Design a protein around this ligand. Sequence first.
Ligand code: MG
Lengths: 267, 248, 298, 299, 402
Amino acid sequence: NQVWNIARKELSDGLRNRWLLAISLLFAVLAVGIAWLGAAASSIPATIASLASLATFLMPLIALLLAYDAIVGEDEGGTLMLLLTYPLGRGQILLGKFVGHGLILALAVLIGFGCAALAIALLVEGVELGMLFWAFGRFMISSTLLGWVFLAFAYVLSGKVNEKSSAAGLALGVWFLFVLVFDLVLLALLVLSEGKFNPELLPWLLLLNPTDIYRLINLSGFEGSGSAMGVLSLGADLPVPAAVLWLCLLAWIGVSLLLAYAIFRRR
Amino acid sequence: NQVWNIARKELSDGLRNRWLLAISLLFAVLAVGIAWLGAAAIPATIASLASLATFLMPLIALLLAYDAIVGEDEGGTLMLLLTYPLGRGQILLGKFVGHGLILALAVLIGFGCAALAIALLVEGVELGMLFWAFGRFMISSTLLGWVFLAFAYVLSGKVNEKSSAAGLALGVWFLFVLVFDLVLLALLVLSEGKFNPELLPWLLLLNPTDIYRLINLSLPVPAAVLWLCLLAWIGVSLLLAYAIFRRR
Amino acid sequence: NAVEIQGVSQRYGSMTVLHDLNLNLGEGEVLGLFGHNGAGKTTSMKLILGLLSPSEGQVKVLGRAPNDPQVRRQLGYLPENVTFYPQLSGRETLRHFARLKGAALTQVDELLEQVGLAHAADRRVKTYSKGMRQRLGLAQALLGEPRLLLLDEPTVGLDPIATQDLYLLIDRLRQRGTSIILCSHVLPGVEAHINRAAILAKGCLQAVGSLSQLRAEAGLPVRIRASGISERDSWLQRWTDAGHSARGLSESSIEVVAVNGHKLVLLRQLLGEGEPEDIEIHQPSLEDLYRYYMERAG
Amino acid sequence: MNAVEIQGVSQRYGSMTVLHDLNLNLGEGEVLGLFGHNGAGKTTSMKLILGLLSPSEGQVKVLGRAPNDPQVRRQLGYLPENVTFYPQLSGRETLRHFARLKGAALTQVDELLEQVGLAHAADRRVKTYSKGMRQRLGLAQALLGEPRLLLLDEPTVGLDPIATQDLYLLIDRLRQRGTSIILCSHVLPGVEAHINRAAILAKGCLQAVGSLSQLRAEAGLPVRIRASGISERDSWLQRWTDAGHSARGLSESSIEVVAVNGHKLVLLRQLLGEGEPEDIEIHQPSLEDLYRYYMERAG
Amino acid sequence: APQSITTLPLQPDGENRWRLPAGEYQGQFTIEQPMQLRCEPGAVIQSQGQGSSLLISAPDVLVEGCTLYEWGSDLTAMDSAVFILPAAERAQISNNRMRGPGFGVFVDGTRDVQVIGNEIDGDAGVRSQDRGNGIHLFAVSGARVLHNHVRNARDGIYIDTSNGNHLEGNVIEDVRYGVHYMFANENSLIDNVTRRTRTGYALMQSRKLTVTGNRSEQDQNYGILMNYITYSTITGNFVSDVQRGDTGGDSMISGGEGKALFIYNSLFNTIENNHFEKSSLGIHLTAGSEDNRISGNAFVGNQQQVKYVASRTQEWSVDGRGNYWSDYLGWDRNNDGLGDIAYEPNDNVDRLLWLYPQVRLLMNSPSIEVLRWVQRAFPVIKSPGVQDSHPLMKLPTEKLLT
Ligand SMILES: [Mg+2]
């Protein structure tokens, strides 16, 4: 298939990016360090909310470092106009780049949360291996989905621009807006209104931010204290169950990938 | 003098940089937004403004001048400019004048609207103390920016490609702002038997971000030693940049 | 009959940037498109590749549709400037393009030696020169026996030993039966290797045909210059007897502007009486023919 | 008054000598072409004429002075290859910047913007310029002041053949005034009508220097006589084989003769005496074929 | 040393009730008989500067309306103004003016003594080390000291081992200590005002006592100092603007930066509804004093709210209702009085400053501003502190500012 033949390139091109392997080893040496501090203090709801905050800062960062120059990095490099004269479509050199960069994020977090689990089962004596495999299995198949959102965000902001220097400004703008501005805009809207703006609409604004849907999935069972949540204490007021929160994370992929394909179809 | 004829280029080229004007606007809003929450909610707000200009004035200086030498070598104009009646000293010092007056203006839009938000929202601020504490603030924020300007000329002349210049410009910003003081705290809270804490006021002089805060927080040395140590960080690193630029 | 463009008048933005070009290309010829870098030449280049839709007209590449996958395995496109993938190697870039076009993987090791790039194989493309990337750009164009090359300036940034060897590689493929289109701007030198030129200007295809036809359909003076002649005083007049102006520009740079209507009587005068030193029948080159047809259009 | 007197230089980097015993003498109004590979044979000899390097075992005398004087570089244009100027600056402000550095008057900026054909795209950014549009800007700074030496390193890359012929028409207007220039090019067909004397040089040494009439006379290269239907191809193929010239047996009605141009005075007498000359083309061995010979003469 | 009968008292009523007319007197005086003597307002009983001026040795003596001047200063021989013997049970000392360099009211061994409404101006020139006590109480059970005005004495109202007694509504200005407590088990004090004092309330080793409604305006370096108090009740105290300074002698306390409340080894006590305002430290909690009911206070305007140099967690909310904090940047979605997120008053970098004072040079650094945000993002590095779930949104002490 042609979707795999161009996925095999990006799997062998993203792994030679030295800027990726710096901040993917930084994801590995911090997830061991958080899980070691979570082992010496024993607690359990504090080492889950800190790992989910660690992957909030880094799994959008590895996704936007990969794919900000996926379309516009090939357009000004000349090899995009060449690729359309090969037996391909615009839907195959985008979904193929999504499969190729998606297996890197599926491997950058299997390295990261894989050694984080081995720094718990070999550190915390008498831990429940069934509870460890289930909690860190929920971390693996949902930090990819957060990574695949910002991967699909980067194809939107690469097809729209026509210069790679302006794509790096938008990819830094999307990383700043969704991670640590929307968490601060929602905080400043709650502080300055003292919680009396809207008592029913404000928990639904967490679904307009995929880093907040990511944090609400992993903090489902291990709630614990309220200050470990912070802004995410609004998530107890959400009447939706846990299964739709998986589906709103997949809908953030599929809407922002069909938008990524409709932009690229009129490139 | 041809040190000014190449300085008028860098004013006209630096003020049209889209990356600089985004950060310099973000520097001027946050200097108002700290002054908004420090007057309605003056040494308490000039210390929080010092922590702001320690974050962004190294970042503004490294965004201007990381591609000053190696960005011209990749563009080919550096090889063209040496065949003109121009020494290698006048290109570097003329870029330092041209990039220097940009962030000497970026603190006048940065703190010119921050001191306006203090002098018009306290109503009795006693502005004779304001124009000497902010006059010492705008001068010392330019000299901090001129260090990281001269730091950017050192790493630009050493590298051969524009991609590895930004990899070093990010590394100097991490090391001199928030890695040197984190290893100062780790030398305190983890070592106490072989770390004299009286020695630590002299190691604050090895960091131009640290000397920047010490002349906005007024200590075994006087004030005048710290002004002559901040200017020594400019004059050594510019002489180091001139020694690197003569070996291309 | 490889490329049969008929009646195409491409409109975009209601501007009509191409108009009514009837460009039939034979099955062994080497055509040359010689417009500017504006919307006349590069629009007709995108029509043959199939990545543009011909409004009001039909483009038939190899007897079929231009965007079919069965004919797009038989094309080869060398673009203008392709800094390909700086972190990939030389073999892995060409094996990537071999998997996409359906070519056999045994062609990659015998194309990195056919093009002079076996010393730089398994080395990264960031360590390549501009000429070495044009060598790599040619290597994916000859991938899997293409029946239609389409080279858009293949000899820029390239040494003249490799440039002369590239046109011999072009002349090997012309005898094999593969039509080549040379969209170029390095017009001195390309006139020895093309079969038919196609000068298009302001959208309208002005002139097409071989080099013998473009000199026949356009009266141009042959420019004989004899630098370093033995005798010069009688050579100002003995050629001017049939209306050929003995115009000079230096101490001895007499560029006699002839009329191309009296070629019998000047050579029987020269070889019947008097010994020559260096006769120079200088045909009207591709710069002078292009400067006539572009001037005729405006 | 020779402009460039490269007098026995020997430039080395470490132990390797990248340029050995180069001995050039460019005249006062000659246009010389430094032809060769992109390695250290040609691109270091271009830098010794500039003030960029120093002769490790010789001396260069550009315009009768040392190459690093400020009086030399005020009358020395240099267009480099693959140049990309400051993209946020405008086209007029880039020339107004370069006129202030060379000491040229600011009234020469608008003359040279009209002269290279950049009047319409002036006051627009360099980022919205083409490749050939930047070559017009890079040529325009080389003509600043009154230059007496130009080093046009690849001037016609990405330029249209009207603008390419506009550039060489500006060269013959310039070299009549007395500005002796230097080409460092690779498009060898086309430059040969304007190169006064070629300077084909190998990896290390200097292979050949002199005019095109001296290179064709010294290097014995065969003339490329092409015809189309004089009398008949098959009746004319036998004649050059007894006279010692190669007659290629092409397909139909075409006579390609590779003659050795030592006998071509009398070889054309029998060709004229039996038929009409109505379509002939005698081509001298070009600079593309001469450079291929001198690379095989050493290497 | 004469007696009270050696004066000229005119009897108004015949139930051992006397009335001294206006006019000065001289020397010490001694009451040996139960005489309920009153005085005219011009009765300036001025001693010569030695001895206890009005010694009382008889039970049930209602001293009223006197004006005492210039008694002794021998603190070792305890030259008081009003000396009250242990046999002088149920003495009433009502509405008196005192000016002299020794003890104002020295009582010892007494029961049900009443020291009401007096004005005791201590000294002006002595260095607050030999001025003598204002109202000294030495092991009295039943006493009622109410609404006096002690100024410029040494350590204010000193109380030593006195069990059951009330201190209601008395104003204490410019003294060393405001109210001193030494082993006074099961005591009580209501609505007292202490102004400009080098320690507002000394609570040393006294259990089971009630400290309610008291005010401390602009005192120095210690607002309410509690040492080893158990089963107490701290309800409604208003501690305002404890500025820095020094006591000048540094005998039993040290110099401080200004602490509105300093809890030293107090195990069980209810600290509710208080108001700690505009000091440098709102509350200092030592490591030995843990697990006591601290809920409902108002920590407004303090430069640092809690100082807690420990790593043990300390919940500060009984029955789900917490304290009002001025820097609490929280919201209230479900419209109750409580906030929705918990409030940690201390970071990890706020306790490195207490452990190591050289971090004060690094306190303006961006790395410290990074480390304040890393704790808010990564709660594994947050040391277990002095948080309270459900803090208050509004001021609970809306009445204490009047
Ligand atoms: Mg609530």
